[PDB]
Write an enzyme that holds these catalytic residues in place. Structure first.
Site, short mmCIF file in Angstrom:
data_model
loop_
_atom_site.label_atom_id
_atom_site.label_comp_id
_atom_site.label_asym_id
_atom_site.label_seq_id
_atom_site.Cartn_x
_atom_site.Cartn_y
_atom_site.Cartn_z
N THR A 186 -19.73 24.61 1.90
CA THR A 186 -18.80 26.05 2.16
C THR A 186 -17.91 26.25 1.02
O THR A 186 -17.90 27.57 0.23
CB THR A 186 -18.36 26.60 3.88
OG1 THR A 186 -17.68 25.14 4.32
CG2 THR A 186 -19.52 26.88 4.60
N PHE A 217 -13.39 31.51 8.18
CA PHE A 217 -12.46 30.51 9.17
C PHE A 217 -12.65 30.01 9.97
O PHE A 217 -12.17 29.41 10.95
CB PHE A 217 -11.82 29.91 8.17
CG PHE A 217 -11.57 29.83 6.61
CD1 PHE A 217 -11.87 28.61 5.87
CD2 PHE A 217 -10.33 31.08 5.89
CE1 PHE A 217 -12.12 28.55 4.73
CE2 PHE A 217 -10.74 30.62 4.36
CZ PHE A 217 -11.53 29.59 4.04
N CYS A 231 -10.91 26.70 11.45
CA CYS A 231 -11.68 25.48 10.16
C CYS A 231 -10.28 24.44 10.14
O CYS A 231 -9.54 25.77 9.62
CB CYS A 231 -12.19 26.27 8.90
SG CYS A 231 -11.98 25.38 7.52
C1 HEM Z 1 -14.74 27.92 2.06
C2 HEM Z 1 -15.00 27.11 2.88
C3 HEM Z 1 -14.78 26.85 4.07
C4 HEM Z 1 -15.18 27.92 5.07
C5 HEM Z 1 -16.15 29.67 5.05
C6 HEM Z 1 -15.39 27.45 6.49
C7 HEM Z 1 -15.49 28.14 7.55
C8 HEM Z 1 -15.84 27.69 8.73
C9 HEM Z 1 -15.70 28.22 10.18
C10 HEM Z 1 -16.12 29.99 9.97
C11 HEM Z 1 -15.55 27.46 11.37
C12 HEM Z 1 -15.50 27.53 12.51
C13 HEM Z 1 -17.04 27.51 13.14
C14 HEM Z 1 -17.50 27.69 14.24
O1 HEM Z 1 -16.41 28.70 14.91
O2 HEM Z 1 -18.83 27.06 14.83
C15 HEM Z 1 -15.02 26.51 10.42
C16 HEM Z 1 -14.80 25.22 11.51
C17 HEM Z 1 -14.59 23.79 10.84
N1 HEM Z 1 -14.59 23.16 8.89
FE1 HEM Z 1 -14.65 24.58 8.37
N2 HEM Z 1 -15.07 26.02 6.10
C18 HEM Z 1 -15.02 25.82 4.99
C19 HEM Z 1 -14.41 24.82 4.73
C20 HEM Z 1 -13.89 23.27 4.97
C21 HEM Z 1 -13.79 22.21 4.92
C22 HEM Z 1 -13.07 22.24 3.68
C23 HEM Z 1 -12.85 20.92 5.75
C24 HEM Z 1 -12.67 19.63 5.50
C25 HEM Z 1 -11.91 19.60 4.76
C26 HEM Z 1 -13.78 21.77 7.21
C27 HEM Z 1 -14.16 20.91 8.11
C28 HEM Z 1 -13.97 22.34 9.26
C29 HEM Z 1 -14.24 21.62 10.10
C30 HEM Z 1 -14.20 20.05 10.87
C31 HEM Z 1 -14.38 22.31 11.19
C32 HEM Z 1 -14.81 22.90 13.25
C33 HEM Z 1 -12.65 22.35 13.62
C34 HEM Z 1 -12.56 22.20 14.41
O3 HEM Z 1 -13.28 23.06 16.14
O4 HEM Z 1 -12.44 21.34 15.49
N3 HEM Z 1 -14.34 23.08 6.31
N4 HEM Z 1 -14.81 26.25 9.30
#
Ligand code: HEM
Ligand code: HEM
Ligand SMILES: CCCCCCCCCCCCCCCC(=O)N[C@@H](CCO)C(=O)O
Ligand SMILES: CCCCCCCCCCCCCCCC(=O)N[C@@H](CCO)C(=O)O
Lengths: 452, 452
Positions: free
Chosen positions: A265, A390, A397
């Site tokens: 992403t 996010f 996130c």
């Molecule tokens: C622009 C970049 C990013 C976007 C747009 C993004 C977007 C998101 C979104 C929308 C969710 C929620 C998902 C849902 O509720 O089903 C999420 C969760 C998460 N993201 Fe990101 N993300 C990005 C970058 C990152 C990065 C760089 C990492 C790790 C270094 C990361 C790790 C995670 C993890 C592990 C979750 C799950 C958190 C939880 O429920 O405990 N993401 N992300």
């Protein structure tokens, strides 16, 4: 009462997902039907939300919890009970959340900065070394950068993507696994033997990803260096609540989760941001003036990246128009009425259609398709639950600050070191792999000849 | 090795406390000298801690126990071996702790809710009944509310503060006793005859507070109503460990303790929260939108107050910047080395400067002076021992859930029922009485005309 898009007899709405661009199809349906529509498949129903009015209720964690969409149920075949694909109530969700949040502390972020610079300098050197009239394959190079950054910062592992003309094997298998998950969304009968080859290829791609996870674990176990990174926390950190560490099975799922969630992403974001900059040259000039004014040293400092305010506004506006993880799913914790109009039963599902939320004219004004970073002059001005690239709440996130620090650093260095040309007058073509990214986006970069 | 602020010859650092704003003076010294400084007076020494890295060690109950600061030794003249001013090793500490902890259970809190609403409705009615361009004296009215709430919920006693234009006599005496304790901190010779009038007035103020305690006990003894409140537990509850109830002398000390600790700091919190809301209108919009969306009934329910997540984040961010009981003291249980650098002997004292802990840029980032409730949006992201407005460990605030339930209810009702104007562009002026509270803070409230 609730609007619903066109149906296909006993297949209900399912054939609407028989497209390589399902999110873009659902956006067009939202434009036709408005803030809420029902989507039915044989044996399932969900409701797609597009307005801040309804999404602010959906984001009330007392009323709704994170659901696994069909997409995330399919991704869970390889990401298991890692953070992205765990239910909030599984013991490993809160344990891993508490164990890994310290890997995104302000101290941890300062610790990652030098390794982010290592990969960013590799990107800048690649582009400095191009010959006359050669071009850049933008999403391909942004994937090289973002995969290498999470590998090195997170796992002290070098993917060496800038040493490859072909996508990294992990990327080939990840993209084919994500594409299979997306293609599976339209399948009425996924155990029809016609899908046996799809299943075989999916298992092969999962094995490629797991073989690399094995290599990262082996490299750490064999290491004589003292690391203090995301893998250190996975292997050693104890949850303050239970007092327990993660077990080996969960650690393997967290490594695949972070390698995918931690780069794909961000590659999308950087690709869309450069797209919008070359299509809005006055915005590019303003961002380039800030990069030149702030980035006064051969490599950016941590504090200099925090001072790239307008570059940050450019990235937020790119996330507004094309949030690269474009939906998240919720279920009702209890019977509740949505918007004073739509009664829901316990367990009823919602999909938040983030690109449509981000086009709500009641929040943003009528000019929602315009790329205007100045919307984010004061990000505090945006209402709650209006800008949600996010996700939401305790299931938001974990990597947001990591992603924005990396993207700000890299875009700042790109704007310091090069002028950009949209030499093909590129027509935006958004490829879907659950996540969104421009496809075929190419530019030319003319060096400003500023040494590193 | 250890930094130390400026000295006054044989008086050492003691005259630094000859100010009506000693905590704010010590905060400025911490900004100058850093995470630790020595503070010496004739015959004593303590060390002021400001960093999470040292305070997390101070909070290790195997190494350090609660100390009575000079402030608390002076307060003990009227609060005796009540919970706030007892040593952990005095029999009456654990006995009263075990007897009264159940008075702060979720079941007890649901039981207090209706009486909290009784007082909150009195506040809202007062402000609804103001004429055009009249203003609100914020800390004055928050003290009316919080004293009345602990009196009614805790003791079935009505202070009737909203029937008075002047502070309640109990408040006049409490404030003058706290002010005397604070003024006594600077006295090299407390038995100098120049302080004879201070001592006479202190004894008079203690008698006013004790006469009110006498009345509360007599009213309960003479009552034909069956109560089940904090006083019921004081008068009847048996400690499960010793099997003993509190004796009459300790009960009197607990009633004084709970009337003071159970309102003053909550009045401070509400006053600082409203200050930050009127100085940050986007935050006020978010909190007011939540109050309108959640508090859908004329009488807020217990469950609705628990649903006010954003209001809760506002209150936590107010406690981050201005924790209203701004320090606590520790002693070394045994010889130990603090932070690998500062050897301590058994009995050596520490002061935790909570406002400076809460400004530790290594934890919170560089923007520590900004009011951003979103710091609290993902609770597990706050590092261990970074946020300590309610103290530490078994000697932490017994009333935390009571204070936060009251403040969330009241701030939610205030934001439901009124728009607020900072009509004077008020300059923050923090009055110190050991505790902290804005002084002279006034606003105008325009009714939204929503019935109760
Ligand atoms: C622009 C970049 C990013 C976007 C747009 C993004 C977007 C998101 C979104 C929308 C969710 C929620 C998902 C849902 O509720 O089903 C999420 C969760 C998460 N993201 Fe990101 N993300 C990005 C970058 C990152 C990065 C760089 C990492 C790790 C270094 C990361 C790790 C995670 C993890 C592990 C979750 C799950 C958190 C939880 O429920 O405990 N993401 N992300
Ligand atoms: C926002 C409001 C409040 C704040 C900031 C606050 C803060 C604190 C702090 C910092 C301590 C520990 C002091 C130390 O270590 O010397 C403490 C202890 C205590 N507080 Fe609170 N307090 C608040 C509200 C209340 C309320 C509403 C009650 C009663 C209903 C209460 C009752 C007590 C008692 C009894 C203790 C002593 C606990 C013992 O050590 O066992 N507090 N409070
Ligand atoms: C292992 C880490 C995971 C990284 C994967 C991130 C994927 C983020 C985007 C997920 C949302 C994509 C939604 C696809 C379109 C959609 O609306 N799907 C619904 C269809 C209704 O059945 C669903 O999956 O029910
Ligand atoms: C009975 C209920 C108690 C209510 C009292 C609540 C007061 C809580 C705040 C106490 C901290 C005040 C610190 C004052 C500033 C300070 O640092 N004092 C040191 C000075 C060094 O001697 C001390 O008292 O040694």
């Amino acid at each position: 009462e609730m609007p619903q898009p066109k149906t296909f007899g006993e297949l209900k709405n399912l054939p609407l997902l028989n497209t390589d661009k399902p999110v873009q199809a659902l956006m067009k349906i939202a434009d036709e039907l408005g803030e809420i529509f029902k989507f039915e498949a044989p044996g399932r129903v969900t409701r797609y939300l597009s307005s801040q009015r309804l999404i602010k209720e959906a984001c009330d964690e007392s009323r709704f919890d994170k659901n696994l969409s069909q997409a995330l149920k399919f991704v869970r075949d390889f990401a298991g009970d890692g953070l992205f694909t765990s239910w909030t109530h599984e013991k490993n969700w809160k344990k891993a959340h508490n164990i890994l949040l310290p890997s995104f502390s302000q101290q941890a972020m300062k610790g990652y900065h030098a390794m982010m610079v290592d990969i960013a300098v590799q990107l800048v050197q690649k582009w400095e070394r191009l010959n006359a009239d050669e071009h850049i394959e933008v999403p391909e190079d942004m994937t090289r950068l973002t995969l290498d950054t999470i590998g090195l910062c997170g796992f002290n592992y070098r993917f060496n993507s800038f040493y490859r003309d072909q996508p990294h094997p992990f990327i080939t298998s990840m993209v084919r696994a994500l594409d299979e998950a997306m293609n599976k969304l339209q399948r009425a009968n996924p155990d029809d033997p016609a899908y046996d080859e799809n299943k075989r290829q999916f298992q092969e791609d999962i094995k490629v990803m797991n073989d690399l996870v094995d290599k990262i674990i082996a490299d750490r176990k064999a290491s004589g260096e003292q690391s203090d990174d995301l893998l250190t926390h996975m292997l050693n950190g104890k949850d303050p609540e239970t007092g327990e560490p993660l077990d080996d099975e969960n650690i393997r799922y967290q490594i695949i989760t972070f390698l995918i969630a931690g780069h794909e992403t961000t590659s999308g974001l950087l690709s869309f941001a450069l797209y919008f900059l070359v299509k809005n040259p006055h915005v590019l000039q303003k961002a380039a003036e800030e990069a030149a004014r702030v980035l006064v040293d051969p490599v950016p400092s941590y504090k200099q990246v925090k001072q790239l305010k307008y570059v940050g506004m450019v990235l937020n506006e790119a996330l507004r128009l094309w949030p690269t993880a474009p939906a998240f799913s919720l279920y009702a914790k209890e019977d509740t009425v949505l918007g004073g109009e739509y009664p829901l039963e316990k367990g009823d599902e919602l999909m938040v259609l983030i690109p449509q939320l981000h086009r709500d004219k009641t929040i943003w004004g009528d000019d929602v398709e315009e790329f205007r970073p100045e919307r984010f002059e004061n990000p505090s001005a945006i209402p709650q639950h209006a800008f949600k690239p996010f996700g939401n709440g305790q299931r938001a996130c974990i990597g947001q600050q990591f992603a924005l620090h990396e993207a700000t650093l890299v875009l700042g260095m790109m704007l310091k070191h090069f002028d950009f040309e949209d030499h093909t007058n590129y027509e935006l073509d958004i490829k879907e792999t659950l996540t969104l990214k421009p496809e075929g986006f190419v530019v030319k970069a003319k060096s400003k000849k500023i040494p590193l």
